[PDB]
Design a protein around this ligand. Structure first.
Ligand code: HEM
Ligand code: HEM
Ligand SMILES: CNCc1cc(Cl)cc(-c2cc(C)cc(N)n2)c1
Ligand SMILES: CNCc1cc(Cl)cc(-c2cc(C)cc(N)n2)c1
Ligand SMILES: C[C@H](O)[C@H](O)[C@H]1CNc2nc(N)[nH]c(=O)c2N1
Ligand SMILES: C[C@H](O)[C@H](O)[C@H]1CNc2nc(N)[nH]c(=O)c2N1
Ligand SMILES: [Zn+2]
Lengths: 414, 418
């Protein structure tokens, strides 16, 4: 079978055969679509692991044009021995690199995947303690930041065993700003991080209580209680936000960090689960300018910017929010570019994604894509992805969500 | 039961209405087709004149639903109605709706339209019964009355006009226009396009049918009307019935020199209304605009009027690189002008902030009284400034309830001319 997707702007039609490889569920049924549900739908047994491992080893040997080779058959035999004797198995370095790159390639919600094959993979599977994790993460940050010429990277800590010895980075990103609830109901800093900030403070962090305090790392090795570490400040690259035309914009006191580094997801490769796998790229400007700065639940700066713009805020139909939103996003891009910190605007990023998508259809037979996430949160229809039909399905290796660790960890101290 | 969450407010709604869904969405548990324009060809009755065992179950389902809606399930009138529909199908292979059922069906087709952000208004719909029409001249009369009623000198009123249902598929009533009022598009000698590029093909059909085009940028197209399966006929809508808004900007005095205008009445005329197995192939309906339909899509789509270049030039923006966001900046100004112009001329219009807020309220109402509200996030979220509207943060479930509005093929792809 085949499925066709059409671009209603260009009338290009692409044919998807890759969807026949789909494994896990989307969340939809034949009579209900759940495409706008954010999170739809203890550890694998010996019998469950065998076919998952085979499927992955088969796809790896096919990608390197060695399917059916003597090395392919011996790897399957070796993997089967380990599952039989140890209830798990260990990836080769080549397989780990392949798996991590393809999990990115398969991330239907990621607009930056034209870069998927250029990923630096740091193997941290020899790590045993939270101090070791800190070292690996510091090296990752320094490598990826590269004095502003950002480089994509992932660091992979030991896989889950019995579920009682998980490695976890408790932070949602490696670098984020604290949030502090005030007695009067206001919030200082980032409201999204209020709960995690409370956890850090309880664990002994002495907070500066400012608007842009970089959070400490909360690292868990081998199922033990997590431990606090301060990222060396010289490793944290930040960009002060100014505007090319409004001299008053710098007086807002805004800044942001250069390195987006997601640290709470799970990497699944051949049935193995890597619960600590922080990965990083570079920003699309709207992530900061639209969501981080203008979500009502985040820094929520629309009103202040519109005030300083002298906009008429008495009625929605003046589009004062829309006008301020654009200027904020001009400032974000101008500031990063001025400081020579890698960033991509939503027009360039979506254009490249269409190129990537078309390439993937030609060479791979498809490209799973989540329109709801791919379309940028402003100016949707003036980007080419708005007009692009997409098919969403789940391929493995994959990045997956997992519960926040504070909701499942059983503590040990005192 | 299924839950949807709003990630801004943390409001959670619980959906049970989806248990009544009738048609496939196109998705499976392994593939989601939520961004496909036409994901499914699943129809409730086959291509044309159904046999009795194909039509009667659908009729019974709808009559059951209607008599349930008025607390008369199993009543004397319900059972007589079933026997009456049974005889009509036995003797004519179809049946005729009562006026009350027709009004109920049209309002519930709107209520069930998962792509429509305007549905808080669903029960305020004026229904014009045009099922006695026999000629394209009569269709023109019905459509003119609809336009005048709905326009109401700028105080727009929602309305639908319903022409005779399909019988054998050879006697179809069709409005060939996609909307009752649209602008012509013309292929220019050098290769460019004058007017609306979306309508170039339809414009050519009209010209080929004898229409004399004034060949400007905003020429209101004639009506191309098909009655009882015959060849379609051209009619000029009386210009005094076509309300238009010249577009100006509250700050930029040069904006009016761009020479832009638009019409006030959005009137979809190419969809099919499906009620109890009956297919009404000509059912023009109209409401009022959300400003982004004109200011974002009509004006700024690359394959429509494509005016971003012009506007940004007059604003003296840096058009050298995408990262200056000159497209985004001009886009906001255009949408400010559209709203300011309609409002200045007292022509009903809603902005995307007010419309999306109203739709969230409508969802909550529907979950409270009906147990659900089918909604297509991809269509409901406006095409600019998405995440600063509340619908962006609202999870939605999409499913297909009947009665409904459906797409149908363009008639020039199927009509065998006489
Ligand atoms: C290289 C530059 C990159 C850019 C410009 C980019 C861009 C983006 C954007 C804008 C999002 C949506 C984020 C949000 O709305 O919260 C996203 C999501 C995502 N990115 Fe990429 N990304 C990049 C690199 C990467 C890398 C290196 C990886 C992994 C190795 C990755 C994996 C993901 C995943 C898994 C998601 C979706 C997470 C989910 O399902 O919630 N991205 N990306
Ligand atoms: C009263 C004011 C109304 C407003 C503000 C409104 C708003 C909208 C908007 C913005 C769209 C998306 C249009 C597009 O992107 O092409 C839409 C679609 C739609 N509307 Fe409404 N609408 C209104 C009234 C109505 C009425 C009276 C009906 C039918 C009786 C209706 C039925 C539909 C349908 C079926 C669609 C989907 C069309 C498709 O799938 O192509 N609407 N509406
Ligand atoms: C939207 N800001 C927070 C956020 C959330 C998520 Cl789920 C992913 C990313 C993300 C990840 C990578 C590797 C690059 C990039 N540009 N963004 C950022
Ligand atoms: C998007 N502009 C063209 C267009 C296309 C479609 Cl499919 C529907 C509507 C539409 C229909 C009604 C009744 C009200 C309204 N505001 N828009 C307009
Ligand atoms: C409810 C809806 O699915 C949710 O708000 C989504 C919409 N699209 C998104 N798209 C991106 N890139 N990031 C997001 O967080 C979201 N949120
Ligand atoms: C491919 C995609 O589904 C298509 O471009 C859709 C996106 N969302 C839309 N939303 C509305 N309201 N109207 C549209 O025409 C579209 N087009
Ligand atoms: Zn779906």
């Amino acid at each position: 079978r085949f499925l066709k997707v059409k671009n209603w702007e260009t009338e290009v039609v692409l044919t998807d055969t890759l969807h026949l490889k789909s494994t896990l569920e989307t969340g939809c049924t034949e009579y209900i679509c759940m495409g706008s549900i954010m999170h739809p739908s203890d550890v694998a047994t010996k019998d469950q692991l065998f076919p998952l491992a085979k499927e992955f080893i088969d796809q790896y040997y096919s990608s390197i044009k060695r399917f059916g080779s003597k090395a392919h058959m011996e790897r399957l035999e070796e993997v089967n021995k380990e599952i039989d004797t140890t209830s798990t198995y260990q990836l080769k370095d080549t397989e780990l690199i392949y798996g991590a790159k393809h999990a990115w390639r398969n991330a239907s919600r990621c607009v930056g995947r034209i870069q998927w094959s250029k990923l630096q993979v740091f193997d941290a599977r020899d790590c045993t303690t939270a101090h070791g994790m800190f070292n690996y993460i510091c090296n990752h940050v320094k490598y990826a930041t590269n004095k502003g010429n950002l480089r994509s990277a992932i660091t992979i800590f030991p896989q889950r065993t019995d579920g009682k010895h998980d490695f976890r980075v408790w932070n949602s990103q490696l670098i984020r700003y604290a949030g502090y609830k005030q007695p009067d109901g206001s919030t200082l800093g980032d409201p999204a991080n209020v709960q995690f900030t409370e956890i850090c403070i309880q664990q002994g962090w002495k907070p500066p209580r400012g608007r842009f305090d970089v959070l400490p790392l909360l690292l868990q090795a081998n199922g033990n209680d997590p431990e606090l570490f301060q990222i060396p400040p010289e490793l944290v690259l930040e960009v002060p936000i100014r505007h090319p035309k409004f001299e008053w914009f710098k007086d807002l006191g805004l800044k942001w960090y250069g390195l987006p580094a997601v640290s709470n997801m799970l990497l699944e490769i051949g049935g193995l689960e890597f619960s600590a796998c922080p990965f990083s790229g570079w920003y699309m400007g709207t992530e900061i300018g639209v969501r981080d700065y203008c979500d009502n639940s985040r820094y929520n700066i629309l009103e202040e910017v519109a005030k300083k713009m002298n906009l008429d805020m008495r009625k929605t139909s003046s589009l004062w929010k829309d006008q301020a939103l654009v200027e904020i996003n001009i400032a974000v891009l101008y500031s990063f570019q001025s400081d020579k910190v890698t960033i991509v605007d939503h027009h360039s990023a979506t254009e490249s994604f269409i190129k990537h998508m078309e390439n993937e259809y030609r060479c791979r037979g498809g490209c799973p894509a989540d329109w709801v996430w791919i379309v940028p949160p402003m100016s949707g229809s003036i980007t080419p992805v708005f007009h692009q039909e997409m098919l969403n399905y789940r391929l493995t290796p994959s990045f997956e969500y997992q519960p926040d660790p504070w909701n499942t960890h059983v503590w040990k101290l005192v």
